[PDB]
Structure 1
């Protein structure tokens, strides 16, 4: 049919449920059991691939504007050991021409990477992944609370992203300063527009690496 390809029964966290993702040339169709949304690629502002602290799962984060209750991110969750092979409903010459060589007609790989590879090609944006941050445990994120719900905080190369309820993305160039506060401890970020995010209940043993990281990134600390 129209679709370049279809990804079936993908785990979505925002909104929650399993959805098919039908990939068309100018939009994707997120097809759920009850709800449906068209998402033009022009509304996709950023992409992130984030390793779950459990070492078994991967988040794929699609930042949306306008949002999809409103969801400013489409967050998909995968197990790292899920594999897929795909045949695009296209000829090879058209595939090369449409996607600058980023895709081929027949592809195979990890499911999370296949979805992100097709999305990256369709929205023409790079996938942001973690840099060198490592927490106390060795993971590339930190367990914490945000708006009285638990999640994971990712210190990236140029920003912070928290997942998943609700998700939050903050660029370093939007930050005026950071603060380390009493409770476990609280990590506070004040933006240049004078608003605040608090990631609370961070286990004490995470302090020094988070402190070292924000220092390395030349963020002001107004303790």
Structure 2
């Protein structure tokens, strides 16, 4: 804080709409902060960084976990973000239902009303996954797909099955 104050005392600072710090990502793997912009999102990592325009997004999927304790937030990309010799077709995020948050936008009330048409507010609070879903919806306009009318025998909304030498969850959307 002292260094920041010393910097501000000499600089003339004039941005991101909202910044989520450290969100459990599964594809790619690791903790990544997410900065929101009017036309894209900056996925900042401890080493690698990516920038996904909203024009590249195709679908947003919000799925529950088999144990009913976690939430999967999937973003379908196009073109896929590239990293050396690998291309990711989906951005997967993992959240916990008991992981709340309180966010405040970097905009004013009237500007938010004009931009998001009242879909968002200057200050919000609620579950982390709910907040991310609401923000991404208000940004992309695409509706977030949710599980259908399927309910497995174990009461879960998916089936545990293998695929390409790897276990995982299959959701009938």
TM-score range (shorter-chain normalised) is: 0.7 to 0.9
* Structure 2 counterpart of 1:143: 160
Relative contact order, higher structure (CA 8 A, sep 6+): 2
Q: Secondary structure at the match of 2:119?
A: coil
Unpaired runs of 5+ residues, structure 1, are: 156-223
How much has 1:74 moved relative to structure 2? 0.4
CA-to-partner distance for each residue in 1:60-111, whole Å, 9 max, x for gaps? 0000000011110000000111000110000011101111211001011100
Number of matched residues? 154
Which among 133, 152, 157 is matched to residue 150 of structure 2? 133
Q: Secondary structure at the match of 1:66?
A: strand
CA-to-partner distance for each residue in 1:135-187, whole Å, 9 max, x for gaps? 110100000011110000001xxxxxxxxxxxxxxxxxxxxxxxxxxxxxxxx
* Structure 1 counterpart of 2:52: 39
CA-to-partner distance for each residue in 1:23-48, whole Å, 9 max, x for gaps? 01111000011110011011010001
How much has 1:131 moved relative to structure 2? 1.4
Q: Secondary structure at the match of 1:116?
A: helix
Unpaired runs of 5+ residues, structure 2, are: 1-14
Looking at structure 2, the residues matched to 43 and 123 of structure 1 have their Cα atoms a distance apart, in angstroms, of: 10
CA-to-partner distance for each residue in 1:1-58, whole Å, 9 max, x for gaps? x000100100110000000000011110000111100110110100010000011100
Which among 107, 116, 141 is matched to residue 124 of structure 1? 141
1:164-203 superposed matches below 5 A: none
* Structure 1 counterpart of 2:102: 85
Looking at structure 2, the residues matched to 145 and 33 of structure 1 have their Cα atoms a distance apart, in angstroms, of: 32
Provide TM-score, normalisation by structure 2: 0.88
How much has 1:133 moved relative to structure 2? 0.1
Provide TM-score, normalisation by structure 1: 0.68
Looking at structure 1, the residues matched to 68 and 109 of structure 2 have their Cα atoms a distance apart, in angstroms, of: 36
1:54-65 superposed matches below 5 A: 54-65=67-78
Deviating above 6 A after TM superposition, structure 1's stretches of 4 or more consecutive aligned residues are none
1:25-36 superposed matches below 5 A: 25-36=38-49
